[PDB]
């Protein structure tokens, strides 16, 4: 039994409630045990409890007297028990209950009014039971109930007589998922005082029954509606008729295997704001199919269209101007589909569109011309996602229409060509370009000329050609702060490659072949590419095969806070290499071949470090090699992960596998 002001006795196989708990506890957690009974006498001294959780037990029934023992009880969780029958005495004396959980108790039917004196109850959960009806009382009570959960039951009908007990109640959420309901008795929804959210997920309805349902929701106070997976195969302009008389703002129609969307199907919801149509089987989207939805601000069409039939060549066709009505649409997610291509007037109309996700939305978008994104001309687009579209070529002036574009993701494609610079023409407000994971990009001096306002450039694993150009291809990028050039295995770069990037803060260069460039044997000496980076904050140089480090490479890196030189063949470092790193807070040198740590190297480095990482190193356990290091470790404030565990010595054989933490420095 763990006491932390909240008594937690979970998974202890307790057959009886503990009697040694302090009189200070207010919460009791008894999930997963073997309690069959709950006597009141065992709960007398603990009259300060405000929350009780006894889920996953074998409790048969509940004593009325017990409810008198906890006058401060707010939340009661009785989920997954054997509590099958309820009476009026069960929860009678628990008037302060605000949350009651009764899931998976195999309750088949509720007697009279067990919850009549629970007028403080806010959330009632009766999920995963065997209730065939919704009647929970014969009078009006529970005016404070806001959530009624009735998931996974045998409820077949909603009757006014059974649901009018909440006439003076305001239900925010009426959960009726996984229920086979086949009829809605007239006036059942008006029987409730205030119904805001209706959830009919996993409920076999059909266009007709859903139509009658919508007719039943008319003139109500509904705001949220979820008809997900109701197998709504088709929709006409009569299906959502009743909803004409509602102020609905959220509609979920996902997982319905929706084949055809008839004209003016959603013309009855001019107040809808959130539309979920993800995961369907739409074969043909007509023009006026999305008419009337001029207040929608978010539309999700993920996997909403049919897959390619391969043989039948059955491609999901989207007619022109099909999105023109959603004038207030700001967020459009059409990712993961088999749309043939981008028509000339496909996205015409969306004059508030700020986010467009086209991730894998097309069968093959192999070429980006100047006419491709012409429909988005009058859209204030800020973010465009074009990943996983098999794009193999980007022509000039392809993004002229997206003048306000800020974030462009062209990653995860087959882009293999020469960047002339004209590909970025029009992007005056460009912020970041994600070009990672592609074929090949041949670089030129004019490659990024037209976009000097760029701050973040990602070229991870794309095979950069001519990156070793004398006038650096990155020269016009003055405002660049983050540059990713990892996984490219570039064997040659020049001195002035990072010239002009005085505002650069984060530099990723891991998994390249820059080793030869830093050896003393390299023609013309070492390549000091870290020259003039006065604002570099995070430097990544892992997995380069570095066996040598020149003394003055890290000279102009004063503001460098995090340095990553792990996963290299580094061993002996020259003196005063980190002499200019005063603002260093994180040092990474794990998985190297370091065999000596001396003061003349890690002196100014260990000054204000808060994170040291040299996990896998073959240290040498002698005085002149480890004394200063161990003596520093014993008195440092630096947080060192796996300090006593993985800091082992590989030499001398006397200290093989011996932790450096336990080395004796009294002999030195």
């Amino acid at each position: 039994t763990v006491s932390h002001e909240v008594a937690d006795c979970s998974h202890l196989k307790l057959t009886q409630v503990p009697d040694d708990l302090p009189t200070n506890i207010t919460v009791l957690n008894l999930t997963h045990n073997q309690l069959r009974r709950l006597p009141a006498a065992n709960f007398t001294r603990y009259s300060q409890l405000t929350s009780l959780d006894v889920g996953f037990n074998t409790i048969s029934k509940l004593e009325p007297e017990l409810c008198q023992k906890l006058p401060m009880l707010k939340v009661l969780n009785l989920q997954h028990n054997e509590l099958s029958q309820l009476s009026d005495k069960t929860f009678a004396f628990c008037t302060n209950l605000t949350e009651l959980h009764l899931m998976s108790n195999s309750i088949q039917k509720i007697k009279n009014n067990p919850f009549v004196k629970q007028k403080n109850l806010i959330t009632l959960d009766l999920s995963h039971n065997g209730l065939s009806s919704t009647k929970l009382g014969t009078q009006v009570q529970l005016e404070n109930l806001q959530e009624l959960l009735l998931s996974n039951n045998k409820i077949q009908a909603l009757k006014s007589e059974e649901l009018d007990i909440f006439a003076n109640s305001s239900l925010k959420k009426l959960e009726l998922s996984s229920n086979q309901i086949k009829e809605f008795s007239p006036g059942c929804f008006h029987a409730i005082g205030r119904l805001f959210g209706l959830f009919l997920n996993n409920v076999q309805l059909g266009p007709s029954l859903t139509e009658k349902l919508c007719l039943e929701l008319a003139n109500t106070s509904i705001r949220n509606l979820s008809l997900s997976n109701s197998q709504l195969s088709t929709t006409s302009n009569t299906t959502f008729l009743g909803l004409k008389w509602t102020n609905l703002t959220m509609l979920d129609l996902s997982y319905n295997n929706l084949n055809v969307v008839g004209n003016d199907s959603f013309a009855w919801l001019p107040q809808l704001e959130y539309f979920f149509l993800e995961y369907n089987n739409i074969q043909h989207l007509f023009s006026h199919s999305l008419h009337g939805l001029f207040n929608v601000r978010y539309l999700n069409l993920k996997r909403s269209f049919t897959k390619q039939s391969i043989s039948l060549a059955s491609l999901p066709k989207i007619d022109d101007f099909s999105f023109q009505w959603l004038k207030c649409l700001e967020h459009l997610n059409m990712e993961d589909n088999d749309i043939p291509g981008i028509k000339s007037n496909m996205f015409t109309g969306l004059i508030n569109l700020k986010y467009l996700s086209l991730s894998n939305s097309f069968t093959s978008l192999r070429t980006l011309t100047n006419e491709t994104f012409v429909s988005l001309a009058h859209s204030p687009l800020h973010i465009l996602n074009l990943t996983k579209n098999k794009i193999s070529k980007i022509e000039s002036d392809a993004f002229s229409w997206l003048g306000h574009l800020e974030v462009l993701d062209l990653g995860l494609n087959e882009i293999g060509q020469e960047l002339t610079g004209q590909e970025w023409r029009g992007l005056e407000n460009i912020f970041e370009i994600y070009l990672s994971y592609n074929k090949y990009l041949q670089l030129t001096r004019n490659s990024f000329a037209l976009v000097p306002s760029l701050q973040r450039l990602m070229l991870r694993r794309v095979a950069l050609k001519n990156v070793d150009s004398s006038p650096s291809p990155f020269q016009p990028l003055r405002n660049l702060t983050i540059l990713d050039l990892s996984n490219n295995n570039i064997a040659n770069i020049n001195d002035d490659m990072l010239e002009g990037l005085e505002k650069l803060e984060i530099l990723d260069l891991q998994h390249n072949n820059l080793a030869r460039l830093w050896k003393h044997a390299n023609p013309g000496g070492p390549i000091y590419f870290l020259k003039g980076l006065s604002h570099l904050h995070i430097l990544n140089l892992e997995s380069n095969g570095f066996d040598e480090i020149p003394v003055e490479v890290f000279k102009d890196l004063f503001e460098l806070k995090i340095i990553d030189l792990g996963l290299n063949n580094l061993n002996t470092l020259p003196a005063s290499v980190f002499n200019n790193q005063v603002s260093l807070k994180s040092l990474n040198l794990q998985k190297n071949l370091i065999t000596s740590v001396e003061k003349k190297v890690f002196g100014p480095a260990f000054r204000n470090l808060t994170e040291l990482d040299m996990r896998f190193n073959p240290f040498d356990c002698t005085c002149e090699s480890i004394a200063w290091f161990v003596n520093w470790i014993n008195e440092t404030h630096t947080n060192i992960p796996e300090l006593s565990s993985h800091y082992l010595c590989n030499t001398p054989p006397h200290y093989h596998g011996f932790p450096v933490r336990l080395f004796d420095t009294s002999s030195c």
Epitope: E414, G416, Y437, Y440, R461, N487, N489, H511, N513, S543
Partner: antibody, heavy 121, light 108 residues
Framework: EVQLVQSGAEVKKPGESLKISCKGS????????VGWVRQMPGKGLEWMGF????????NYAPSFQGQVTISADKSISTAYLQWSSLKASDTAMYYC??????????????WGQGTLVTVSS | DIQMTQSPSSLSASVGDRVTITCRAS??????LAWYQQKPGKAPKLLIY???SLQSGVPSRFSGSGSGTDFTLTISSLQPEDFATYYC?????????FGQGTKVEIKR
């Protein structure tokens, strides 16, 4: 009918110059990269590096940087691999493969028949 | 760079058995991993690309799964001519590193 055929088995002494061939036919030669693979007798497959037949852009493995020279001939549609001065440890089986970019990663579908390089005193 | 290590090193299974070879990566190679098959004395053969995709012309009994640093090649029903050395390769970096391969033998 994509086909890649390399040169015959070479037998030279340590110090002699060597240049094995790799000609492709039946496919668009300058459309797909050509990579090389070394396999020492009894050891696993090792990556050498690749080259684009069009512009002869070379990208060697960090292990073989400066230790070998990958070339290519767009006209004959034949990528070459050469050593200026052979070594005692250059004795291995050399394959050439075509890099097909599928699933957003370079994969090798078509391979050569293999060139056995035997270098000893 | 990236270290690719397979397991087990060599196994023996009868014709019709379902065999699973595992491929571990030192660091996350994401979804980019390929499976190649090598017959003795003959050039390798591309079985799987992108960890789960089946290459054109490859027998139906070959499957592949996994992500992050864990991958798995699976032979549904072994064949008398399915004995070979199966290597895995990573493509998250331009420095492709193969595994040490796995030797498949038959439990006749």
């Amino acid at each position: 009918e994509v086909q890649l055929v390399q040169s015959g088995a070479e037998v030279k002494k340590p110090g002699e110059s060597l240049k094995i061939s790799c000609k492709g036919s039946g496919y668009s030669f300058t459309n797909y990269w050509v990579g090389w693979v070394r396999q020492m007798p009894g050891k696993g497959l090792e990556w050498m590096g690749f080259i684009d037949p069009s512009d002869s852009y070379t990208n060697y493995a960090p292990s073989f940087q400066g230790q070998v020279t990958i070339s290519a001939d767009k006209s004959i549609s034949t990528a070459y691999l050469q050593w200026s001065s052979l070594k005692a440890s250059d004795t291995a089986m050399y394959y050439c493969a075509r890099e097909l970019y599928q699933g957003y990663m370079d994969t090798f579908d078509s391979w050569g028949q293999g060139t056995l390089v035997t270098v000893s005193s | 760079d990236i270290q690719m290590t397979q397991s087990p090193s060599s196994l023996s299974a009868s014709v019709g058995d379902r065999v699973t070879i595992t491929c571990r990566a030192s660091q996350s190679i994401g979804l980019y991993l390929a499976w190649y098959q090598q017959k003795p004395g003959k050039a390798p053969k591309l079985l799987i690309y992108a960890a789960s995709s089946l290459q054109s012309g490859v027998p139906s009994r070959f499957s592949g799964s996994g992500s992050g640093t864990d991958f798995t090649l699976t032979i549904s029903s072994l064949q008398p001519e399915d004995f070979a050395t199966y290597y895995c390769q990573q493509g998250n970096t331009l420095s492709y590193t193969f595994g040490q391969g796995t030797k498949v033998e038959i439990k006749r």
